[PDB]
Ligand binder design. Sequence first.
Ligand code: AN7
Ligand code: AN7
Ligand code: NA
Ligand code: NA
Ligand code: NA
Ligand code: NA
Ligand code: NA
Ligand code: NA
Ligand code: NA
Ligand code: NA
Ligand code: NA
Ligand code: NA
Ligand code: NA
Ligand code: NA
Ligand code: NA
Ligand code: NA
Ligand code: NA
Ligand code: NA
Ligand code: NA
Ligand code: NA
Ligand code: NA
Ligand code: NA
Ligand code: NA
Ligand code: NA
Ligand code: NA
Ligand code: NA
Ligand code: NA
Ligand code: NA
Ligand code: NA
Ligand code: NA
Ligand code: NA
Ligand code: NA
Ligand code: NA
Ligand code: NA
Ligand code: NA
Ligand code: NA
Ligand code: NA
Ligand code: NA
Ligand code: NA
Ligand code: NA
Ligand code: NA
Lengths: 455, 455
Amino acid sequence: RTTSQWRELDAAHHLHPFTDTASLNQAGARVMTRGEGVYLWDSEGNKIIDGMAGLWCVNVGYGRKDFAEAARRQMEELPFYNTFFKTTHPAVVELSSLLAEVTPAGFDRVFYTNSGSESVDTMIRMVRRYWDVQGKPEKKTLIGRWNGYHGSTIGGASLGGMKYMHEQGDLPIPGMAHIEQPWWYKHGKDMTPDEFGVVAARWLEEKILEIGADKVAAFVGEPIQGAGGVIVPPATYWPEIERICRKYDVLLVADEVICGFGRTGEWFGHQHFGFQPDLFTAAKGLSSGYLPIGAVFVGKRVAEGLIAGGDFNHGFTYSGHPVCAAVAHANVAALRDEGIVQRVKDDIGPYMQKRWRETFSRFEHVDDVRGVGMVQAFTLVKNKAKRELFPDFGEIGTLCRDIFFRNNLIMRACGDHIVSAPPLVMTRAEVDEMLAVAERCLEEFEQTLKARGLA
Amino acid sequence: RTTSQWRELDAAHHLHPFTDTASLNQAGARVMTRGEGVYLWDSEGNKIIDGMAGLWCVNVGYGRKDFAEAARRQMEELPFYNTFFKTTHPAVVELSSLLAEVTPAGFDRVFYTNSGSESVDTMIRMVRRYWDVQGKPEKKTLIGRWNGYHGSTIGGASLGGMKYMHEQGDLPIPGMAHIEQPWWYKHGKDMTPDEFGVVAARWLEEKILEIGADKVAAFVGEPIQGAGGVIVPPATYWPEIERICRKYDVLLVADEVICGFGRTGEWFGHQHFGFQPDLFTAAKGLSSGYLPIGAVFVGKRVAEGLIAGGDFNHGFTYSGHPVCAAVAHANVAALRDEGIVQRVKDDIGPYMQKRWRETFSRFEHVDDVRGVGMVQAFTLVKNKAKRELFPDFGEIGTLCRDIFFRNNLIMRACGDHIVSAPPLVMTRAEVDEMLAVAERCLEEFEQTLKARGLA
Ligand SMILES: Cc1ncc(COP(=O)(O)O)c(/C=C/C(=O)C(=O)O)c1O
Ligand SMILES: Cc1ncc(COP(=O)(O)O)c(/C=C/C(=O)C(=O)O)c1O
Ligand code: NA
Ligand code: NA
Ligand code: NA
Ligand code: NA
Ligand code: NA
Ligand code: NA
Ligand code: NA
Ligand code: NA
Ligand code: NA
Ligand code: NA
Ligand code: NA
Ligand code: NA
Ligand code: NA
Ligand code: NA
Ligand code: NA
Ligand code: NA
Ligand code: NA
Ligand code: NA
Ligand code: NA
Ligand code: NA
Ligand code: NA
Ligand code: NA
Ligand code: NA
Ligand code: NA
Ligand code: NA
Ligand code: NA
Ligand code: NA
Ligand code: NA
Ligand code: NA
Ligand code: NA
Ligand code: NA
Ligand code: NA
Ligand code: NA
Ligand code: NA
Ligand code: NA
Ligand code: NA
Ligand code: NA
Ligand code: NA
Ligand code: NA
């Protein structure tokens, strides 16, 4: 099939996630055909640096023939059996055992899903069920954040803080609340980041006291806000959030769907920020996106509460899917046994973070250069000295993203935030190759800015 | 690993869907290891007739080496790329094109998910977005049915009518309503099924007038209620439901997650019952459960409304997953090209339905023997002449299910309904083998009933 033919069929038959379908069907979809390591090829033969690892998820990179063999072997033996009929199967038991080896102490039990969105919905029902079992049926509100992202289920979209999502489906659903995000560049006023971290965390205490602690089930947050634009909270933030949750007997939930499976150099983002959640949600890196699988990692407190409650009337046909479980097992064993996570912490993470800051700090219209391990970002700004953002936040980001894409580099615009999360296996040479393209793209971005009198 | 070892690890580490974890961890999980055609083997070497095709989904049966090859080939070439970044990939374009060939007229466009539950959430947001685009932001309530099942997302569980699910998570969410199910055995009084069908459909008109048509977005139903116990509505029901929806400007949605991909002998259950939905939800048979994938099939009217609305701020990381798409393609091509769906309509379906009625009609405590194509059921009853059900509806079904399972036959109890949905490829010999075991099991069931003084 030609590029033209694939585009014709895509436009005629396919509705995409988070897309202006009318626009895409006219402009034509870019057809990605092949992946190897950190690179993609499109139908026009372009070699592309995937600085987003598929969608924050292809943590071991493309081309794992060993994962394809594990999928083939399991699909030939038992492609599917359900976990509903007082039944199990070896692939799901083996994965559950391996996950207990790599997760923090106290995380013995896992509930399986297909997606991060299903994991968040599962976590919401688990949190509410937990408090019902404790004899507190009033304790049902989950608190999230504006510009937080917790997936695209009605439940996940509700707990997320994307107004563009809320306005499609009449969200949020009841028993959801939101506090402002710990975005120092915009909300920091004359505070230091560390001062601001305590203030941004105390917005949770304010919201708890407004609602009433007796009605608040949980606080949920991404250790680093992903889709919101790699919002890295100050070092003082998570310890204050945790103090507040424990003071008011509110459960603390990490959304690890991006930060999980080595993205920060720790196995999990909550380990990097030094907080101890009761539950955490996972997908993406769990299987390096090779097959759909998500999980809720359930701490001892909530697991004992759920087990005390008899039936949990929840789950998905494909929960624990043997083939997805077999591939996730291969993926997690690789992340440990090949030293991929340890390499992010001790080697490629510090290299990426140093080189990221070296590359982007000098630009007139770049600020808040940031990152941890193998997640990094910056913001395109009208004026650094004034911390002044561009109007129509997102228009300038789209301009920059389109320049990257034209130059066969994938980095994502989140409003006017530019973000990167490449495969964890990226080499030092590949980091420098990626930053060389990004640097030339920013030089062109700045030229165009001044040319249009936008600078 | 031994049976004992698998059970120890499962109990220590795995939380199952729709399970009493405390009970399962004591009793021990049955470990399914291998599948071939209509049979499973457990860790103790028992050969099992899978009369439920995994979970209503393994439509082409176990052992498709060609599906494992398609998965391996795609996973080696491009295991994952996202459909979010104005991007596509061959596997998703090819599947989208093939689906348009096999789906009813007007269904050109498909939105992908991982699960039936995600497909239902997608459909809810699509229906609400549609009415917003039409300038009717009041038009947001979806009506389902008591004992309807639409998955295990917060959205799907809300639209579903399982009270045991509603009581876990504070459901239903707003803009959800429910009417009684068209269950003639319980609600039929001295009406004929056809008389009852019109009355049960008019419950929808009554509910619409109670709420106000201006507030009602859609009516959603499974053509045949699956998890509710294969509730087969009268022939008069769906045409009346459709008349009522069109009269009041309400969208009509088929949940095809079980009935889809040949289960009734039609490609889709709505075709068998003769109604024209605006959207339908799918999973299970879409890939014969070989990998997780679901879809919303969007009719011309709702697709034009969504496309008119610019951005649809919805979707999942693994929407359109290349490897799942490659396997679904192989599955759908097999269902068509190997004549599997046609064979249900013209050959094995009528054989199953005749043999099912021949086998179960004679039993003193069996009634409402029913089915079409390769979905069939009956109800365990205290007294046929009185249409008297057993008290604690579900206790007697569990007794019967446990006898089946002990005799290496998988049939599911839905309350006191016994249901079957085996692989569509089941032979006449395999139908007779399955019914011979079920028959001997019902003889034992009746003995035990009387022994316990429950009869
Ligand atoms: C923190 C967090 N929590 C949950 C989800 C939902 O997982 P999926 O339902 O498997 O998509 C995501 C995913 C975000 C994107 O889809 C994206 O990358 O734009 C996430 O980052
Ligand atoms: C009509 C209908 N609509 C939606 C779903 C949800 O799909 P998944 O999210 O893929 O589980 C189901 C599934 C039912 C079962 O899980 C079961 O068979 O017990 C369904 O039958
Ligand atoms: Na290569
Ligand atoms: Na630890
Ligand atoms: Na710990
Ligand atoms: Na509303
Ligand atoms: Na400041
Ligand atoms: Na997103
Ligand atoms: Na640390
Ligand atoms: Na650290
Ligand atoms: Na390696
Ligand atoms: Na170290
Ligand atoms: Na540089
Ligand atoms: Na603005
Ligand atoms: Na045994
Ligand atoms: Na290859
Ligand atoms: Na076609
Ligand atoms: Na059709
Ligand atoms: Na047709
Ligand atoms: Na149509
Ligand atoms: Na019910
Ligand atoms: Na409302
Ligand atoms: Na509402
Ligand atoms: Na009833
Ligand atoms: Na009578
Ligand atoms: Na009414
Ligand atoms: Na169910
Ligand atoms: Na009439
Ligand atoms: Na009208
Ligand atoms: Na082919
Ligand atoms: Na074909
Ligand atoms: Na074939
Ligand atoms: Na054909
Ligand atoms: Na065949
Ligand atoms: Na026929
Ligand atoms: Na009677
Ligand atoms: Na029992
Ligand atoms: Na029993
Ligand atoms: Na056979
Ligand atoms: Na037998
Ligand atoms: Na009798």
